Amino acid sequence: MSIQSKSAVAKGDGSFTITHVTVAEPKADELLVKIKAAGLCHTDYDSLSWGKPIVMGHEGAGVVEKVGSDIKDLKKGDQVLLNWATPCMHCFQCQEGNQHICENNSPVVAGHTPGHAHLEGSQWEGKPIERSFNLGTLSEYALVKESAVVKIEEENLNFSAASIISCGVMTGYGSVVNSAKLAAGSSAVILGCGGVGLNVINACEISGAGRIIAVDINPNKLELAKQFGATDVILADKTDVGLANVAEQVKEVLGGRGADYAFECTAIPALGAAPLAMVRNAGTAVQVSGIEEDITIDMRLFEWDKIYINPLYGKCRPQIDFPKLMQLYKKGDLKLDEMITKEYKLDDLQQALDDMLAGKNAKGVVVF
Amino acid sequence: SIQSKSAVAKGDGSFTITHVTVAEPKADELLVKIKAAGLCHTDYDSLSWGKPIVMGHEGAGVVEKVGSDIKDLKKGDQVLLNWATPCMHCFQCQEGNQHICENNSPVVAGGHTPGHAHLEGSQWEGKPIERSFNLGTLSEYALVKESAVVKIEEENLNFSAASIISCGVMTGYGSVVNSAKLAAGSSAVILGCGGVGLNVINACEISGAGRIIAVDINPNKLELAKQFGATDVILADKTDVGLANVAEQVKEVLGGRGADYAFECTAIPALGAAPLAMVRNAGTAVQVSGIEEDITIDMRLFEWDKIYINPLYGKCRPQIDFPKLMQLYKKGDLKLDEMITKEYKLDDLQQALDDMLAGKNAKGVVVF
Amino acid sequence: SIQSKSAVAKGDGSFTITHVTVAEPKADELLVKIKAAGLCHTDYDSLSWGKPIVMGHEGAGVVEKVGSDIKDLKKGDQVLLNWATPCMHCFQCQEGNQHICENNSPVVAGGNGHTPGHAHLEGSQWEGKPIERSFNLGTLSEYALVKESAVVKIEEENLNFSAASIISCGVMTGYGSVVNSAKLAAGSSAVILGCGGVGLNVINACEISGAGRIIAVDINPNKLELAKQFGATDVILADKTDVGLANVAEQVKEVLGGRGADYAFECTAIPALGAAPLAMVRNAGTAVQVSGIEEDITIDMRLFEWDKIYINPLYGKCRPQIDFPKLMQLYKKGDLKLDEMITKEYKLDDLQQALDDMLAGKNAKGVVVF
Amino acid sequence: SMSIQSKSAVAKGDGSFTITHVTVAEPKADELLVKIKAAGLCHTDYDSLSWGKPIVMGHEGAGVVEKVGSDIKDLKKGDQVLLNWATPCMHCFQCQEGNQHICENNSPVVAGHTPGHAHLEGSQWEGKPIERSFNLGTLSEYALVKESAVVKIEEENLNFSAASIISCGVMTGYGSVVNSAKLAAGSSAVILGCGGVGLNVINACEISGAGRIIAVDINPNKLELAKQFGATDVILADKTDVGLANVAEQVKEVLGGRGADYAFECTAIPALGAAPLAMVRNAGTAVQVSGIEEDITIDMRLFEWDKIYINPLYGKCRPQIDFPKLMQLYKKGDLKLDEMITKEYKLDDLQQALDDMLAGKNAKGVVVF
Ligand SMILES: NC(=O)c1ccc[n+]([C@@H]2O[C@H](COP(=O)([O-])OP(=O)(O)OC[C@H]3O[C@@H](n4cnc5c(N)ncnc54)[C@H](O)[C@@H]3O)[C@@H](O)[C@H]2O)c1
Ligand SMILES: NC(=O)c1ccc[n+]([C@@H]2O[C@H](COP(=O)([O-])OP(=O)(O)OC[C@H]3O[C@@H](n4cnc5c(N)ncnc54)[C@H](O)[C@@H]3O)[C@@H](O)[C@H]2O)c1
Ligand SMILES: NC(=O)c1ccc[n+]([C@@H]2O[C@H](COP(=O)([O-])OP(=O)(O)OC[C@H]3O[C@@H](n4cnc5c(N)ncnc54)[C@H](O)[C@@H]3O)[C@@H](O)[C@H]2O)c1
Ligand SMILES: NC(=O)c1ccc[n+]([C@@H]2O[C@H](COP(=O)([O-])OP(=O)(O)OC[C@H]3O[C@@H](n4cnc5c(N)ncnc54)[C@H](O)[C@@H]3O)[C@@H](O)[C@H]2O)c1
Ligand code: NA
Ligand code: NA
Ligand SMILES: [Zn+2]
Ligand SMILES: [Zn+2]
Ligand SMILES: [Zn+2]
Ligand SMILES: [Zn+2]
Ligand SMILES: [Zn+2]
Ligand SMILES: [Zn+2]
Ligand SMILES: [Zn+2]
Ligand SMILES: [Zn+2]
């Protein structure tokens, strides 16, 4: 039979629908993956306003349903994590180790790319539909290129836990460990304790930060922050321009000097320079949200030797980073189980989105 | 109490050649007979700090008189001046960031410091007068702390060449070597080919950059850039907002990809984000001018993984870096002699300042 | 001139509990009332230096008396001691390498004699002769005369001075070897050869830094059980005959799935194992030799082959004023397990037992408390 | 399709070599046939005489594409190519770390034949497959290689002799300074052994901005060459100086009582493998470039204190990244490739080029076709 996969589709007018997408047999370098769990990221919300129809979802874990003619490393029944780098392995950036900004295949930096499965293989209302971030994980079956999958091998695997590795975990963890290269014993400030920020916090704790200050406008998020390793919390005011008041409090909590590292995770474009306010001179400020607007910045915030970086996807190298995360999860340091606040069914995607936006969840996941 | 002919900036935008009353040195201080004093763009800015100052923060000379506790200097020793005057004991000094010393930096801690000679030691209109950047080199005789000098030992020393080490050379060289850590074989864009920018260019050539693209609005400065290492020149539009036309030309010149490194040192506040437009993803953008204003930034310029840094004084560690610069001068790699465009007597400071702003000099020096 | 009960090594191989005359501090000096002193093998070695020594190079205490120039410290201040006593002005100090200070380091610049990091030689007298203090400190004493560069101020209620006293040497060395020297990255794999005072702190530091696998190796199975306390994920009983631990390297590759570890640390004090961490790591891995070896040894140079970084760091690249307060915070946070490292506390008059227990391998760390 | 009889230098596996013909066959889909224009000589080519198996010698070369396999789309007949012996797979753990030079699948050093080598039946001698040295075999009129072995360049009036030595001597010396040591401008550097590799180490320290560059050799002709490539200081070592201990004292003398920031050992002498440690100050960086596969005796005080010691392979070459950077440094005049070509040889005079190498008469010798 022709595969009819129950899916979430964003129509490109601002709204989404639960519906069915027709999914092909894989070409030679593609796989058919049965999704067991799909995580929800803030960017899925933004993806409703892209102005083109897409199968939604770019966090997901599952099992190989069927393999293309030229795939050797994978077979039906294999457990897999999905990544949206889908890197080409030959371009300049891939050879620098920057698989996450692959010049040919990145859905962000190149985009639909050769990291996307063949376009006609996914059909909605009898027409090809794009797969969000080359994946489209809010769907019973996803068609993906081989470079989208990382094979794992775990008994009694919690697939809801595994599904969030794909974005929130990898981005938050990689921003700490790959980009900032946070040193043990140091002080770290996290601005915004949501899907990404709670993983920055977890990763600061894994990395051995001596002080970890969590900042949010929502008191429920601060309490989650403590679960994942924050040593201090600061409730911000929405009216705190550039979080400048928070910066003075950080200096006071640390004894008169700014933090060694700060991470911005708020999804608020106006707060793009806030991590610079938090750090001492020669500190490291990492802006994780990604901002595509003009904003006004007091350039004094850059003064003096502060490193500022806006990294993509935590500098993800999927076949390298995902097994390292899996090992930290199994060891007990990476707290993926506790991060899954609620599981939902695909029909209740709206309630899951609302619980995310309302600040009720660390991470919500759709389970199939 | 000696009378030293000096350039004093009154706190109104104006200066006057006058006499400053200099006292004998305290136990940890020194009287330096200035042989040559370099001119920095910042000396122009210092006219409009609303306080009387003994101008000048670049200089070389000979030790005139030594205080009680000075053990390794004597009358007659050749010395270079530095304005870091580091305390050697605070957190930043112990980090090796002597240039942002939390106690003595005239920039970071002034706003004053123990890096300044005793305030009574320098007087004008019957009042203590401060010495620019703890130095005040545009003066026949300077009173300074020991941490302000670096002893050198040279035969037939060109004091003019030595005088510009104190700021323009250290800042430009250090921004490349200590702050950006530019790798041999890379591509580099330099925006602004002035006293700092020509030393950034020199330092890219010393460092082994494969392509060095010099950018200025003044054709005379581009011809000078070719002397110091530039392999390519771009004449910019004084009305190219954000230098976006220059970015397209860079990508064109480099074969379709942005540069590995870009350095901004135009003294134009609105160009503070410009080096980001010049570099590829994961490139390094260094903002050398130092901007204290609000400016509007297209935050897309930070996407993705670009390192942006605003270093102070090229991360100068004077007793370490100044001898390395002297060796590079002696070796023929650091082209100090070509940088000295004209030598002025103190009474002609105005003409020196005019030639500075008219773009007629790489460096002008005042000679005594 | 105050009289301080002290452990003096006589040089002949013996030591005695005695009293040592300690002057008031000159202007850059200060008198510390030692609360606790850690013990390690170096103190046994200071019995055979062939000159009378005030023993002890690990300690924590309280300022008793301050010299005329000291401004940072006052009577009653809690202090940790460090044996780097850096000068802050030489090339290495300006490089951030205070632990190898060209002027004051008792290891680098102490060539039989003592350095300017030592308090003035006449400030400590035994039998009418001036007496040298071990590593510029002499902490196995009720009152120690030291330079300001030797102490790091801290402020804690209910401070476990015994825990505090071991930061001075083994903790700094093993933690620093991981964090400052190897700069171990979270998620990686690490092998630790030798699980004594240094090695257990290497293991703790790998755990603190977030290694995904931590393989402990020792010839003493009791030490492997301890290694599990401090965070080891896997343990290997090494065979004392195994030359260069070639069998252990094979087992490491098996445990890890076919490739060497990212990092390996050698803490065995066995000269012939100096190159062993090379055998444990993959190509382009990092091999850290913590022991310090001064003998000629024969090395199969294929072990270096191919991009392995090899380093023999001193004192964990300690910058005392920066690193000791960070360690204190990790202790307060619960991550650095100082309390669990203290196997036994001793009286100064018990020093003979504490050295016997140490040489017998009975302790993780022994501490003298006053 | 035909079977080319390629005149070649073959090491027989008995310690000798011969000039002979090797049969080279049609390239498979991911392979290609290269007409060699020039082949450099590296000290390792002489070590390959002792490997105990027949090999087509040579692992430095530059040439033009003679024929492209079915699936090659980025190269055509006539294209200029530099050869590299990393032949990286691009998918293993090391390749994804950026360490294509120690590829776990394809490296002829760390894996080897490998899938970095062209199909084994494609090169034949005495009726049976013959391995190509370092997956290349450049001392031959035509080489059969994998696509991963070539870097396309385009340059009018290219000097192929200068281009041929990028393949090993230049990349190893340059990369050991810039990729491994990460030598910082203004620092002091000591180079032990001024040969094919050491002279490129010296060039790369000059390119990188070292303030002091101290060349050391037992051969006075090499010290004169070293000055051409940027040495500010030269020291004639004695063959009697165990560990180069007296040289170490003179390095400190020359640097005002202090050890150097960086030292590179390039001597091909196994007993000298620890020598760079004695040249450097505490927290200095010592780079052992030769590669030693023997037991030696090391005074372990040489490691004392924070000295980084490292034995890098092939200058950490990522050939598609590094080789274009080297080509640009050559074109702008900083990398002095032309000046490294001391003498050019016919293939039949390969014996003379090997004696000239071992006698120390050349910077680099190349065979031209
Ligand atoms: N760079 C990347 O590769 C990458 C990857 C994933 C997500 N993102 C981006 O990261 C951002 C955050 O993602 P998320 O899933 O964690 O979203 P989220 O909604 O789960 O978390 C946002 C958090 O920021 C808090 N916050 C809002 N305003 C604040 C303020 N003024 N001060 C302090 N805290 C404030 C919110 O309460 C919330 O807890 C999104 O913009 C998303 O697009 C980037
Ligand atoms: N970070 C530090 O420690 C430090 C130290 C010294 C100076 N500075 C700062 O560096 C800046 C430059 O100093 P300087 O002495 O080199 O000044 P300068 O006047 O000598 O040179 C500035 C150059 O920028 C050129 N320029 C102006 N507008 C341009 C444009 N739109 N595009 C391209 N080029 C343009 C000018 O033609 C001139 O050549 C000053 O703002 C100064 O305060 C910083
Ligand atoms: N670099 C520095 O600054 C510094 C500072 C302090 C101590 N050290 C040195 O570190 C070394 C270790 O000191 P320590 O106090 O931990 O000594 P220790 O005796 O307490 O521990 C050494 C451990 O190595 C084990 N071991 C012995 N042989 C072994 C083998 N063949 N294989 C595996 N394990 C073996 C032993 O069982 C013992 O547990 C000493 O040499 C000491 O001199 C160096
Ligand atoms: N790590 C790698 O990837 C790599 C790559 C190429 C070559 N190599 C190795 O590098 C080494 C050098 O190769 P090469 O082609 O430059 O050889 P070479 O023969 O051209 O040069 C060796 C130099 O060392 C000199 N020398 C000999 N003894 C000396 C001594 N006691 N003191 C000082 N100098 C001495 C010689 O006079 C000669 O100039 C070889 O062992 C070779 O196998 C390694
Ligand atoms: Na941890
Ligand atoms: Na250069
Ligand atoms: Zn996402
Ligand atoms: Zn790519
Ligand atoms: Zn200036
Ligand atoms: Zn300071
Ligand atoms: Zn000890
Ligand atoms: Zn020192
Ligand atoms: Zn070679
Ligand atoms: Zn590979």
PDB file of N, CA, C and O in Angstrom, chain B residues 265-304:
ATOM      1  N   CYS B 265      39.106  49.729  12.021  1.00  0.00           N
ATOM      2  CA  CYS B 265      39.836  50.766  12.746  1.00  0.00           C
ATOM      3  C   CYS B 265      39.803  52.080  11.974  1.00  0.00           C
ATOM      4  O   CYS B 265      40.824  52.721  11.706  1.00  0.00           O
ATOM      5  N   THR B 266      38.567  52.486  11.668  1.00  0.00           N
ATOM      6  CA  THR B 266      38.204  53.697  10.961  1.00  0.00           C
ATOM      7  C   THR B 266      37.911  54.883  11.870  1.00  0.00           C
ATOM      8  O   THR B 266      37.834  56.008  11.359  1.00  0.00           O
ATOM      9  N   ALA B 267      37.706  54.663  13.181  1.00  0.00           N
ATOM     10  CA  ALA B 267      37.257  55.696  14.121  1.00  0.00           C
ATOM     11  C   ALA B 267      35.851  56.221  13.794  1.00  0.00           C
ATOM     12  O   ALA B 267      35.441  57.266  14.303  1.00  0.00           O
ATOM     13  N   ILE B 268      35.098  55.519  12.949  1.00  0.00           N
ATOM     14  CA  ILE B 268      33.723  55.880  12.614  1.00  0.00           C
ATOM     15  C   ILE B 268      32.793  55.005  13.454  1.00  0.00           C
ATOM     16  O   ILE B 268      32.750  53.781  13.235  1.00  0.00           O
ATOM     17  N   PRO B 269      32.027  55.572  14.396  1.00  0.00           N
ATOM     18  CA  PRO B 269      31.174  54.710  15.246  1.00  0.00           C
ATOM     19  C   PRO B 269      30.192  53.853  14.459  1.00  0.00           C
ATOM     20  O   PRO B 269      29.943  52.696  14.831  1.00  0.00           O
ATOM     21  N   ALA B 270      29.636  54.382  13.367  1.00  0.00           N
ATOM     22  CA  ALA B 270      28.654  53.644  12.586  1.00  0.00           C
ATOM     23  C   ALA B 270      29.237  52.422  11.875  1.00  0.00           C
ATOM     24  O   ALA B 270      28.470  51.599  11.376  1.00  0.00           O
ATOM     25  N   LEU B 271      30.558  52.267  11.820  1.00  0.00           N
ATOM     26  CA  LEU B 271      31.160  51.126  11.140  1.00  0.00           C
ATOM     27  C   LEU B 271      31.543  49.996  12.089  1.00  0.00           C
ATOM     28  O   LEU B 271      32.248  49.070  11.677  1.00  0.00           O
ATOM     29  N   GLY B 272      31.079  50.037  13.340  1.00  0.00           N
ATOM     30  CA  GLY B 272      31.558  49.086  14.327  1.00  0.00           C
ATOM     31  C   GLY B 272      31.256  47.641  13.993  1.00  0.00           C
ATOM     32  O   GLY B 272      32.016  46.740  14.373  1.00  0.00           O
ATOM     33  N   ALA B 273      30.156  47.397  13.283  1.00  0.00           N
ATOM     34  CA  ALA B 273      29.769  46.057  12.863  1.00  0.00           C
ATOM     35  C   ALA B 273      30.337  45.663  11.504  1.00  0.00           C
ATOM     36  O   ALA B 273      30.203  44.500  11.110  1.00  0.00           O
ATOM     37  N   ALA B 274      30.956  46.599  10.786  1.00  0.00           N
ATOM     38  CA  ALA B 274      31.440  46.341   9.433  1.00  0.00           C
ATOM     39  C   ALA B 274      32.329  45.106   9.291  1.00  0.00           C
ATOM     40  O   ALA B 274      32.172  44.386   8.288  1.00  0.00           O
ATOM     41  N   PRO B 275      33.270  44.805  10.191  1.00  0.00           N
ATOM     42  CA  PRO B 275      34.116  43.625   9.957  1.00  0.00           C
ATOM     43  C   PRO B 275      33.334  42.328   9.896  1.00  0.00           C
ATOM     44  O   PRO B 275      33.805  41.381   9.256  1.00  0.00           O
ATOM     45  N   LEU B 276      32.134  42.267  10.477  1.00  0.00           N
ATOM     46  CA  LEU B 276      31.313  41.060  10.374  1.00  0.00           C
ATOM     47  C   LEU B 276      30.852  40.813   8.940  1.00  0.00           C
ATOM     48  O   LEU B 276      30.766  39.655   8.501  1.00  0.00           O
ATOM     49  N   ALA B 277      30.504  41.886   8.215  1.00  0.00           N
ATOM     50  CA  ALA B 277      30.089  41.749   6.818  1.00  0.00           C
ATOM     51  C   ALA B 277      31.220  41.243   5.936  1.00  0.00           C
ATOM     52  O   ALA B 277      30.960  40.649   4.886  1.00  0.00           O
ATOM     53  N   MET B 278      32.463  41.428   6.367  1.00  0.00           N
ATOM     54  CA  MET B 278      33.619  41.047   5.573  1.00  0.00           C
ATOM     55  C   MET B 278      33.979  39.569   5.687  1.00  0.00           C
ATOM     56  O   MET B 278      34.657  39.055   4.789  1.00  0.00           O
ATOM     57  N   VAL B 279      33.590  38.876   6.767  1.00  0.00           N
ATOM     58  CA  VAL B 279      34.109  37.529   7.001  1.00  0.00           C
ATOM     59  C   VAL B 279      33.052  36.472   6.693  1.00  0.00           C
ATOM     60  O   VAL B 279      31.839  36.706   6.775  1.00  0.00           O
ATOM     61  N   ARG B 280      33.540  35.295   6.315  1.00  0.00           N
ATOM     62  CA  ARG B 280      32.722  34.107   6.141  1.00  0.00           C
ATOM     63  C   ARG B 280      32.120  33.678   7.484  1.00  0.00           C
ATOM     64  O   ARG B 280      32.518  34.148   8.554  1.00  0.00           O
ATOM     65  N   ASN B 281      31.176  32.744   7.426  1.00  0.00           N
ATOM     66  CA  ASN B 281      30.726  32.106   8.657  1.00  0.00           C
ATOM     67  C   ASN B 281      31.921  31.454   9.340  1.00  0.00           C
ATOM     68  O   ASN B 281      32.843  30.970   8.673  1.00  0.00           O
ATOM     69  N   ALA B 282      31.914  31.477  10.677  1.00  0.00           N
ATOM     70  CA  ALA B 282      32.997  30.993  11.530  1.00  0.00           C
ATOM     71  C   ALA B 282      34.275  31.819  11.383  1.00  0.00           C
ATOM     72  O   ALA B 282      35.333  31.409  11.899  1.00  0.00           O
ATOM     73  N   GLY B 283      34.212  32.982  10.721  1.00  0.00           N
ATOM     74  CA  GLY B 283      35.333  33.901  10.666  1.00  0.00           C
ATOM     75  C   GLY B 283      35.470  34.739  11.940  1.00  0.00           C
ATOM     76  O   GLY B 283      34.676  34.640  12.880  1.00  0.00           O
ATOM     77  N   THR B 284      36.525  35.564  11.970  1.00  0.00           N
ATOM     78  CA  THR B 284      36.879  36.360  13.151  1.00  0.00           C
ATOM     79  C   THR B 284      36.868  37.835  12.785  1.00  0.00           C
ATOM     80  O   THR B 284      37.598  38.261  11.891  1.00  0.00           O
ATOM     81  N   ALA B 285      36.047  38.613  13.477  1.00  0.00           N
ATOM     82  CA  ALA B 285      35.925  40.046  13.248  1.00  0.00           C
ATOM     83  C   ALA B 285      36.440  40.790  14.477  1.00  0.00           C
ATOM     84  O   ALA B 285      35.952  40.563  15.590  1.00  0.00           O
ATOM     85  N   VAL B 286      37.404  41.683  14.275  1.00  0.00           N
ATOM     86  CA  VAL B 286      38.026  42.439  15.360  1.00  0.00           C
ATOM     87  C   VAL B 286      37.773  43.920  15.119  1.00  0.00           C
ATOM     88  O   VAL B 286      38.126  44.460  14.063  1.00  0.00           O
ATOM     89  N   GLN B 287      37.222  44.573  16.136  1.00  0.00           N
ATOM     90  CA  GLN B 287      36.747  45.959  16.135  1.00  0.00           C
ATOM     91  C   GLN B 287      37.808  46.703  16.955  1.00  0.00           C
ATOM     92  O   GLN B 287      37.839  46.581  18.181  1.00  0.00           O
ATOM     93  N   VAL B 288      38.697  47.453  16.307  1.00  0.00           N
ATOM     94  CA  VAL B 288      39.811  48.021  17.053  1.00  0.00           C
ATOM     95  C   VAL B 288      39.528  49.428  17.582  1.00  0.00           C
ATOM     96  O   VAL B 288      40.101  49.812  18.611  1.00  0.00           O
ATOM     97  N   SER B 289      38.626  50.178  16.945  1.00  0.00           N
ATOM     98  CA  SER B 289      38.430  51.585  17.288  1.00  0.00           C
ATOM     99  C   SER B 289      38.017  51.770  18.746  1.00  0.00           C
ATOM    100  O   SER B 289      38.616  52.572  19.475  1.00  0.00           O
ATOM    101  N   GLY B 290      37.010  51.024  19.198  1.00  0.00           N
ATOM    102  CA  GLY B 290      36.427  51.267  20.509  1.00  0.00           C
ATOM    103  C   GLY B 290      35.319  52.298  20.388  1.00  0.00           C
ATOM    104  O   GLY B 290      35.594  53.481  20.177  1.00  0.00           O
ATOM    105  N   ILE B 291      34.064  51.871  20.493  1.00  0.00           N
ATOM    106  CA  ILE B 291      32.914  52.735  20.259  1.00  0.00           C
ATOM    107  C   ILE B 291      32.114  52.844  21.549  1.00  0.00           C
ATOM    108  O   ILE B 291      31.756  51.822  22.146  1.00  0.00           O
ATOM    109  N   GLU B 292      31.826  54.079  21.974  1.00  0.00           N
ATOM    110  CA  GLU B 292      31.058  54.320  23.194  1.00  0.00           C
ATOM    111  C   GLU B 292      29.636  54.784  22.916  1.00  0.00           C
ATOM    112  O   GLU B 292      28.952  55.247  23.832  1.00  0.00           O
ATOM    113  N   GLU B 293      29.171  54.658  21.687  1.00  0.00           N
ATOM    114  CA  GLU B 293      27.864  55.151  21.290  1.00  0.00           C
ATOM    115  C   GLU B 293      26.885  53.994  21.159  1.00  0.00           C
ATOM    116  O   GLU B 293      27.278  52.829  21.073  1.00  0.00           O
ATOM    117  N   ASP B 294      25.600  54.333  21.124  1.00  0.00           N
ATOM    118  CA  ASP B 294      24.589  53.438  20.577  1.00  0.00           C
ATOM    119  C   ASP B 294      24.683  53.434  19.062  1.00  0.00           C
ATOM    120  O   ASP B 294      24.826  54.489  18.434  1.00  0.00           O
ATOM    121  N   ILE B 295      24.586  52.247  18.462  1.00  0.00           N
ATOM    122  CA  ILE B 295      24.475  52.139  17.011  1.00  0.00           C
ATOM    123  C   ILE B 295      23.471  51.045  16.688  1.00  0.00           C
ATOM    124  O   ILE B 295      23.194  50.159  17.499  1.00  0.00           O
ATOM    125  N   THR B 296      22.929  51.112  15.479  1.00  0.00           N
ATOM    126  CA  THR B 296      21.983  50.112  15.019  1.00  0.00           C
ATOM    127  C   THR B 296      22.746  49.049  14.241  1.00  0.00           C
ATOM    128  O   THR B 296      23.555  49.373  13.370  1.00  0.00           O
ATOM    129  N   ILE B 297      22.504  47.786  14.566  1.00  0.00           N
ATOM    130  CA  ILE B 297      23.204  46.675  13.932  1.00  0.00           C
ATOM    131  C   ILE B 297      22.176  45.729  13.339  1.00  0.00           C
ATOM    132  O   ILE B 297      21.213  45.350  14.019  1.00  0.00           O
ATOM    133  N   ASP B 298      22.385  45.342  12.079  1.00  0.00           N
ATOM    134  CA  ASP B 298      21.653  44.215  11.509  1.00  0.00           C
ATOM    135  C   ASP B 298      22.211  42.932  12.117  1.00  0.00           C
ATOM    136  O   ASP B 298      23.320  42.503  11.780  1.00  0.00           O
ATOM    137  N   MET B 299      21.451  42.314  13.023  1.00  0.00           N
ATOM    138  CA  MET B 299      21.979  41.190  13.788  1.00  0.00           C
ATOM    139  C   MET B 299      22.206  39.954  12.936  1.00  0.00           C
ATOM    140  O   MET B 299      22.857  39.017  13.408  1.00  0.00           O
ATOM    141  N   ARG B 300      21.685  39.925  11.704  1.00  0.00           N
ATOM    142  CA  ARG B 300      22.039  38.868  10.763  1.00  0.00           C
ATOM    143  C   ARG B 300      23.535  38.826  10.489  1.00  0.00           C
ATOM    144  O   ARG B 300      24.057  37.772  10.092  1.00  0.00           O
ATOM    145  N   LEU B 301      24.225  39.954  10.670  1.00  0.00           N
ATOM    146  CA  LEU B 301      25.666  39.995  10.451  1.00  0.00           C
ATOM    147  C   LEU B 301      26.428  39.054  11.373  1.00  0.00           C
ATOM    148  O   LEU B 301      27.532  38.628  11.015  1.00  0.00           O
ATOM    149  N   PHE B 302      25.872  38.721  12.544  1.00  0.00           N
ATOM    150  CA  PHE B 302      26.535  37.790  13.457  1.00  0.00           C
ATOM    151  C   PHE B 302      26.317  36.329  13.086  1.00  0.00           C
ATOM    152  O   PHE B 302      27.084  35.469  13.533  1.00  0.00           O
ATOM    153  N   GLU B 303      25.291  36.028  12.294  1.00  0.00           N
ATOM    154  CA  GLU B 303      25.042  34.661  11.838  1.00  0.00           C
ATOM    155  C   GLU B 303      26.044  34.346  10.732  1.00  0.00           C
ATOM    156  O   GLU B 303      26.140  35.119   9.784  1.00  0.00           O
ATOM    157  N   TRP B 304      26.834  33.267  10.856  1.00  0.00           N
ATOM    158  CA  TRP B 304      26.866  32.336  12.012  1.00  0.00           C
ATOM    159  C   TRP B 304      28.308  32.006  12.368  1.00  0.00           C
ATOM    160  O   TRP B 304      29.216  31.938  11.540  1.00  0.00           O
TER     161      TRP B 304
END
